[PDB]
Design a protein around this nucleic acid. Structure first.
Ligand SMILES: Nc1ccn([C@H]2C[C@H](O)[C@@H](COP(=O)(O)OP(=O)(O)OP(=O)(O)O)O2)c(=O)n1
Ligand SMILES: Nc1ccn([C@H]2C[C@H](O)[C@@H](COP(=O)(O)OP(=O)(O)OP(=O)(O)O)O2)c(=O)n1
Ligand SMILES: [Mg+2]
Length: 579
DNA sequence: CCTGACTCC
DNA sequence: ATGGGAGTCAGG
């Protein structure tokens, strides 16, 4: 039973200095998406406004953009970006219920106001999907039904703010929300709306050449197989490998023979065709995802792509990137890495600038574990990825290739995060006995890491959750399970989540600090992407010198640990050349 | 619609 | 049974 005004025009009482605000965008991808309705709840009452009315009203636009007029919202980034596409600036967001719910418990997967409301037994609001429908049936409902929904969402935010803030405070997470996540949200909104420019001429030419290449590789595979088949079907491929060619079956899953890359690599001594197939599947992913998939989402008039950074999704505090994912662009193989040549500055005589934290989760672990040897390694500015490489490959520091260092990187993180002898052995294609002895020596080098991992598992059993440096939390209710697999996975989340999450806390803080410095120094430079422990910027070529000092400094000083933080940086004419 | 493939941190 | 965190794709 909820009264509200379906307003025909904006009135002064709608423009109070505190309000719950709903700016509704139904489409999952909110870039250039319709705003279908607006709701405002404040001390004076409850109001629904039509966007064509409200958004062309100069007082309402003024109010949206006035930082002293405070708004509580759910997913303020979605509203901010949708408004930027409407040419309107949103300021003064003081509470975001999505971010509040996320910090209280990321496992709730809260994706609408109703699911957040449930956390406090508030039920005077419906789920979005129940209002709009799903798939081909998704639609905006009749105005009265829409209006009531948006108003109930705003009223929920109005009533839920204090109970959420109260609980965050009890958890010592209120500052994490107000000083970190909420300011980051506005920064991500800027990055997403800016977008990254793409060289479509180059990408399309790449794609044409790649198609010819796939054809050649495909026919070679059919020749080796003695038959045509769909190489992109693990079922058909399994029949070829394990029935026609009679190769050993190393692994099965629930649907049939495994053809994972791990398995095919191990079959190379039996038939050369597995190497061709691995190459083919790489090339096919390049074409489907990083050529075709990317071209499909380029906005043609500006040649820009606009990702969405999901800030309330991952269980550790990382961001994710969708439609397109710009956090998994190829780099490890030169063939794939060339895609990066198609990511270019948005203005002429600008350049791309990239900065990456050195050995980040190993520095974080040194600090949190207080491992004397590892802490001293970072004080000696050593490279643990390179050192591990020299060992596993029996090679000098000068003969270690970037590829070797990449592999050693997975060995280091594998070991500290609980890899077994079976897994390490399968990884380095070495003897299981050899792998076990290697793990043993690793923890004899870093015994504090070992103690830390034993202890954090016990603490997680006792408390039911683990925490990061800035008080981010993950609950682990499975960790005392009688079941071995269920318990074991939970134990390994206790080992990993605090470290990966603390690293996420750090780069989030650096983005805030960096933008503040950019503004203070009046630089045109701005952030384009975050890639977990990297920041990618564009700026006039004349700003590179400054950035070379400023960016790494801000990143390195974002937090003070018991070890130095270190940042590598590069710049060039394209994302590829920023190395 | 899921599974298993390739991509990154 | 067998490091952890992610997203997109073709095939079925
Ligand atoms: N009410 C609070 C207090 C702290 N924090 C988060 C953000 C802070 O940046 C981080 C660190 O807190 P402090 O700097 O105040 O140090 P603490 O006293 O909390 O010690 P510790 O972090 O070891 O628990 O914790 C928070 O979100 N809300
Ligand atoms: N196989 C991997 C690779 C990375 N990561 C995590 C831990 C890494 O510290 C972090 C960053 O990825 P990087 O590739 O940037 O690795 P580093 O920062 O550790 O090393 P560097 O930047 O010096 O190459 O992501 C991981 O858990 N497992
Ligand atoms: Mg790094």
């Amino acid at each position: 039973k909820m009264a509200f005004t379906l307003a025909d025009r904006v009135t002064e009482e709608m423009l109070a200095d505190k309000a719950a605000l709903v700016v509704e965008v139904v489409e999952e991808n909110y870039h250039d998406a319709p705003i279908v309705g607006i709701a405002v709840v404040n001390e004076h009452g409850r109001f629904f406004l039509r966007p064509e009315t409200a958004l062309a009203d100069p007082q309402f636009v003024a109010w949206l953009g006035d930082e002293t007029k405070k708004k509580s919202m759910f997913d303020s980034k979605r509203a901010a970006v949708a408004l930027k596409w409407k040419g309107i600036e949103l300021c003064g967001v003081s509470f975001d219920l999505l971010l509040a719910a996320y910090l209280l418990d990321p496992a709730q997967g809260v994706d609408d106001v109703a699911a957040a409301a449930k956390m406090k037994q508030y039920e005077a609001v419906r789920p979005d999907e129940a209002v709009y429908g799903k798939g081909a049936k998704r639609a905006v409902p009749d105005e009265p039904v829409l209006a009531e929904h948006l108003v109930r969402k705003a009223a929920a935010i109005w009533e839920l703010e204090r109970p959420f803030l109260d609980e965050l405070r009890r958890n010592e997470q209120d500052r994490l929300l107000v000083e970190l996540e909420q300011p980051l949200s506005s920064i991500l909104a800027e990055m997403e709306f800016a977008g990254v420019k793409v060289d479509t001429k180059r990408l399309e030419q790449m794609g044409k050449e790649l198609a010819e290449q796939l054809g050649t590789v495909e026919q070679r595979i059919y020749e080796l197989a003695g038959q045509e088949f769909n190489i992109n079907s693990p079922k058909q491929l399994g029949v070829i490998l394990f029935e026609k060619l009679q190769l050993p079956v190393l692994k099965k899953t629930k649907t049939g023979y495994s053809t994972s890359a791990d398995v095919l690599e191990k079959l190379a001594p039996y038939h050369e065709i597995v190497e061709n197939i691995l190459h083919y599947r790489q090339l096919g992913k390049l074409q489907s995802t990083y050529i075709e998939g990317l071209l499909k989402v380029v906005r043609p008039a500006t040649k820009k792509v606009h990702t969405i950074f999901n800030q309330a999704l991952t269980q550790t505090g990382r961001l994710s990137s969708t439609e397109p994912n710009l956090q998994n662009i190829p780099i490890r193989l030169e063939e794939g890495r060339k895609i990066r040549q198609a990511f270019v500055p948005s203005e002429s005589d600008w350049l791309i600038f990239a900065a990456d934290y050195s050995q980040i989760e190993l520095r974080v672990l040194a600090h949190i574990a207080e491992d004397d040897n590892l802490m001293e390694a970072f004080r000696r500015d050593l490279d643990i990825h390179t050192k591990t490489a020299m060992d596993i490959f029996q090679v000098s520091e000068d003969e270690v290739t970037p590829n070797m260092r990449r592999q050693a990187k997975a060995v280091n993180f594998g070991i500290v995060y609980g890899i077994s002898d079976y897994g390490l052995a399968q990884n380095l294609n070495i003897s299981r006995k050899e792998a076990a002895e290697f793990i043993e020596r690793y923890f004899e080098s870093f015994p504090g890491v070992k103690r830390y991992m034993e202890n954090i598992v016990q603490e997680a059993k006792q408390k039911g959750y683990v925490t990061t440096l800035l008080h981010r939390r993950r609950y682990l209710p499975d960790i005392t399970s009688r079941n071995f697999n269920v318990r074991s996975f939970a134990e390994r989340m206790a080992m990993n989540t605090p470290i990966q999450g603390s690293a996420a806390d750090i780069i989030k803080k650096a983005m805030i600090d960096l933008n503040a410095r950019l503004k203070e120094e009046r630089l045109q430079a701005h952030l384009l992407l975050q890639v977990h422990d990297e920041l990618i910027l564009e700026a006039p070529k004349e700003e590179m010198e400054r950035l070379c000092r400023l960016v790494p400094e801000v990143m390195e000083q974002a937090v003070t640990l018991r070890v130095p933080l270190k940042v590598d940086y590069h710049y060039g004419s394209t994302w590829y050349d920023a190395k």
